[PDB]
């Protein structure tokens, strides 16, 4: 007589219950309810739990202690007339579905599995008024997936206690994000730093306002001089010059606000203003989606609905003014970004988040909303010097119009260039030279590495998180003062890897395994097919690591004595 909806979470259970009427009735399952465990041999095959020699039959398995969750899920679909899986979206979660009802079991025709990316009562409304089918293709893009982590995992990690050190882990796309850190750290270590100086000038303009300069061309060549000499000669020249106006340059500039955020860029942000971890931002972030709060935080789409940008305009033009909102909607490029589920709860009228969590809803309520606001319009001004031979530059700036600016906190901006036309004689006041020195690519953060990953294609909004999380304490790299550091040991499995599974450390192949991944999920490749050629590859590379290694085989972490 009534539905039975399930979700995953007693959180995201009582949000979803205040928009589902009398007939329906939500449970969590808080957690997952199975899973798996924790030329072949039967002793690896059941610890691994997956069988790549018997067209990979697995054997998943109720999960500790819940077994008797299990047992209160089967009663409650009895006495229901119909079952809704309303699981999260992603992949994962139409795996987490499948297997709600392979563990309850009876027949498709009771089962439905709904979709929505934000909990609100319009977005429920949808879901359940035209359901939806549990797609399988997805399903087992994401069962190919943890297959080969746990061929990974399992079968390389064994070889590493053997050569190196018992204790010692690998991963398919872990072992890859440490290659990237260890080539960073061995850059910076074979830096060789340069000199380099420059030479700035105070100067007076006719009516007398102050004048700032900077030499850039002498010779009609770009001005750079490599030691303490070489700028004293330069410097004793540009003392008897005499000082000119060239040329102004007056042109109006404008600044865009940026696109909504995608998980990539809110862990940038959230990590470069706010100072918070990857972790942090990621358990914050699904705190607020399932409190029904904001949309889904795992998306890499930069769409907004015709209803949010509606909802977003109206309170633009209602709390700041018919010159802040654009003739037509901005149009950055199924699913949708992250931002507010409702544009009008302020961060402060957050019930039950504490307060980082408020300082996330903010940050992407800022960006939402400037996000749909014209730009900024400033006042750009360049004097070009003539100096004798020398060339000197001074920039300025005016702001005209704040623009989307407004919703930013207001400006702690430095520049005004005094009055001058072009001809006018300036006076020589002072000359300060300056000493440099080049400088040695910057540390990897937890920051700038999601960024890279995200660049070459190797991420997944889904599994950033975890990857960085991964790497860290297996002792292969540390954090500290917010940075990226290469351990020994880090260097000393990359190299193994390096030289006896080239394959699997190669940047384009984890990125075209991607793009397998995506093919099995919209039915463009077999599972199947694509975790035997995966395997292919992977013994062949596993069976030469494992011979001596006058046979080729991994060289062993050991220093022959005298
Ligand atoms: C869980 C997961 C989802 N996704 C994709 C699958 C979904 O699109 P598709 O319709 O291809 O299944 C989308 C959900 O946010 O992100 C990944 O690429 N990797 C993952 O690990």
Same mark, same amino acid.
């Not at 909806?5 to 808080?30: C, F, M, Q, R």
């Given at each position: 007589?009534?539905?039975?909806?399930? #979700?995953?979470?007693?959180? %995201?259970? %009582?949000?979803?219950?205040?928009?589902?009427?009398?007939?329906?009735?939500?449970?969590?399952?808080?957690?997952?309810?199975?899973?798996?465990?924790?030329?072949?041999?039967?002793?690896? #095959?059941?610890?691994?739990?997956?069988?790549?020699? $018997?067209?990979?039959?697995? $054997?998943?398995?109720?999960?500790? /202690?819940?077994?008797?969750?299990?047992?209160?899920?089967?009663?409650?679909? =009895?006495?229901?007339?119909?079952?809704?899986?309303?699981?999260?979206?992603?992949?994962?979660? *139409?795996?987490?579905?499948?297997?709600?009802?392979?563990?309850?079991?009876?027949?498709?025709?009771?089962?439905?599995?709904?979709?929505?990316?934000?909990?609100?009562?319009?977005?429920?409304?949808?879901?359940?008024?035209?359901?939806?089918?549990?797609?399988?293709?997805?399903?087992?893009?994401?069962?190919?997936?943890?297959?080969?982590? +746990?061929?990974? /995992?399992?079968? #390389?990690?064994?070889?590493?206690?053997?050569?190196?050190?018992?204790?010692?882990?690998?991963?398919?796309?872990?072992?890859?994000?440490?290659?990237?850190?260890?080539?960073?750290?061995?850059?910076?270590?074979?830096?060789?730093?340069?000199?380099?100086? =420059?030479?700035?000038?105070?100067?007076?303009?006719?009516? /007398?306002?102050?004048?700032?300069?900077?030499?850039?061309?002498?010779?009609?060549?770009?001005?750079?001089?490599?030691?303490?000499?070489?700028?004293?000669?330069?410097?004793?020249?540009?003392? %008897?010059?005499?000082? @000119? #106006?060239?040329?102004?340059?007056? %042109?109006?500039?404008?600044?865009?606000?940026?696109?909504?955020?995608?998980?990539?860029?809110?862990?940038?942000?959230?990590?470069?203003?706010?100072?918070?971890?990857?972790?942090?931002?990621?358990?914050?972030?699904?705190?607020?989606?399932?409190?029904?709060?904001?949309?889904?935080?795992?998306?890499?789409?930069?769409?907004?609905?015709?209803?949010?940008?509606?909802?977003?305009?109206?309170?633009?033009?209602?709390?700041?003014?018919?010159?802040?909102?654009?003739?037509?909607?901005?149009?950055?490029?199924?699913? &949708?970004?992250?931002?507010? @589920?409702?544009?009008?709860?302020?961060?402060?009228?957050?019930?039950?988040?504490?307060?980082?969590?408020?300082?996330?809803?903010?940050?992407?309520?800022?960006?939402?909303?400037?996000?749909?606001?014209?730009?900024?319009?400033?006042?750009?001004?360049?004097?070009?010097?003539?100096?004798?031979?020398?060339?000197?530059?001074?920039?300025? +700036?005016?702001?005209?119009?704040?623009?989307?600016?407004?919703?930013?906190?207001?400006?702690?901006?430095?520049?005004?260039?005094?009055?001058?036309?072009?001809?006018?004689?300036?006076?020589?006041?002072?000359?300060?030279?300056?000493?440099?020195?080049?400088?040695?690519?910057?540390?990897?953060?937890?920051?700038?590495?999601?960024?890279?990953? =995200?660049?070459?294609?190797?991420?997944?909004?889904?599994?950033?998180?975890?990857?960085?999380?991964?790497?860290?304490?297996?002792?292969?790299?540390?954090? &500290?003062?917010?940075?990226?550091?290469?351990?020994?040991?880090?260097?000393?499995?990359?190299?193994?890897?390096? *030289?006896?599974?080239?394959?699997?450390?190669?940047?384009?192949?984890?990125?075209?395994?991607?793009?397998?991944?995506?093919?099995?999920?919209? $039915?463009?490749?077999?599972?199947?097919?694509?975790?035997? $050629?995966?395997?292919?590859?992977?013994?062949?590379?596993?069976?030469?690591?494992?011979?001596?290694?006058?046979?080729?085989?991994?060289?062993?972490?050991?220093?022959?004595?005298?």
């Amino acid at each position: 007589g009534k539905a039975l909806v399930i #979700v995953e979470s007693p959180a %995201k259970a %009582k949000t979803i219950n205040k928009y589902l009427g009398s007939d329906y009735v939500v449970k969590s399952s808080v957690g997952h309810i199975r899973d798996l465990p924790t030329d072949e041999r039967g002793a690896l #095959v059941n610890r691994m739990g997956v069988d790549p020699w $018997h067209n990979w039959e697995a $054997h998943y398995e109720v999960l500790p /202690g819940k077994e008797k969750v299990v047992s209160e899920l089967k009663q409650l679909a =009895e006495k229901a007339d119909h079952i809704y899986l309303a699981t999260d979206l992603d992949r994962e979660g *139409e795996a987490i579905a499948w297997h709600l009802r392979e563990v309850i079991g009876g027949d498709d025709a009771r089962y439905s599995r709904v979709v929505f990316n934000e909990i609100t009562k319009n977005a429920i409304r949808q879901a359940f008024n035209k359901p939806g089918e549990l797609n399988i293709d997805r399903v087992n893009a994401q069962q190919a997936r943890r297959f080969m982590d +746990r061929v990974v /995992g399992y079968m #390389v990690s064994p070889l590493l206690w053997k050569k190196i050190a018992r204790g010692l882990s690998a991963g398919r796309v872990q072992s890859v994000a440490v290659r990237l850190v260890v080539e960073r750290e061995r850059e910076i270590k074979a830096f060789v730093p340069e000199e380099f100086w =420059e030479v700035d000038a105070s100067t007076t303009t006719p009516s /007398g306002e102050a004048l700032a300069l900077q030499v850039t061309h002498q010779n009609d060549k770009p001005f750079r001089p490599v030691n303490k000499e070489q700028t004293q000669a330069a410097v004793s020249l540009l003392e %008897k010059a005499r000082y @000119s #106006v060239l040329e102004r340059e007056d %042109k109006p500039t404008t600044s865009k606000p940026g696109a909504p955020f995608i998980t990539s860029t809110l862990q940038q942000a959230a990590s470069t203003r706010l100072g918070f971890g990857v972790k942090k931002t990621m358990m914050m972030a699904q705190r607020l989606y399932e409190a029904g709060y904001i949309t889904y935080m795992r998306t890499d789409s930069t769409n907004l609905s015709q209803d949010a940008v509606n909802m977003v305009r109206g309170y633009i033009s209602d709390n700041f003014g018919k010159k802040y909102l654009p003739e037509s909607p901005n149009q950055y490029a199924a699913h &949708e970004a992250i931002r507010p @589920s409702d544009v009008n709860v302020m961060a402060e009228s957050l019930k039950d988040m504490e307060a980082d969590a408020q300082k996330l809803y903010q940050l992407i309520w800022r960006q939402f909303v400037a996000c749909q606001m014209t730009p900024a319009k400033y006042d750009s001004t360049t004097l070009t010097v003539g100096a004798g031979d020398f060339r000197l530059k001074a920039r300025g +700036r005016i702001l005209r119009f704040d623009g989307w600016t407004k919703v930013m906190p207001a400006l702690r901006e430095d520049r005004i260039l005094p009055a001058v036309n072009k001809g006018d004689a300036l006076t020589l006041v002072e000359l300060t030279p300056a000493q440099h020195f080049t400088k040695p690519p910057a540390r990897f953060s937890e920051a700038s590495l999601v960024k890279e990953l =995200e660049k070459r294609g190797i991420g997944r909004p889904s599994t950033y998180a975890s990857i960085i999380s991964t790497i860290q304490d297996r002792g292969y790299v540390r954090v &500290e003062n917010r940075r990226f550091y290469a351990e020994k040991m880090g260097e000393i499995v990359t190299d193994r890897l390096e *030289e006896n599974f080239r394959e699997l450390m190669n940047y384009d192949f984890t990125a075209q395994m991607e793009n397998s991944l995506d093919q099995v999920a919209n $039915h463009e490749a077999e599972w199947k097919a694509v975790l035997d $050629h995966f395997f292919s590859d992977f013994t062949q590379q596993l069976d030469k690591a494992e011979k001596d290694p006058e046979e080729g085989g991994m060289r062993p972490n050991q220093m022959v004595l005298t």
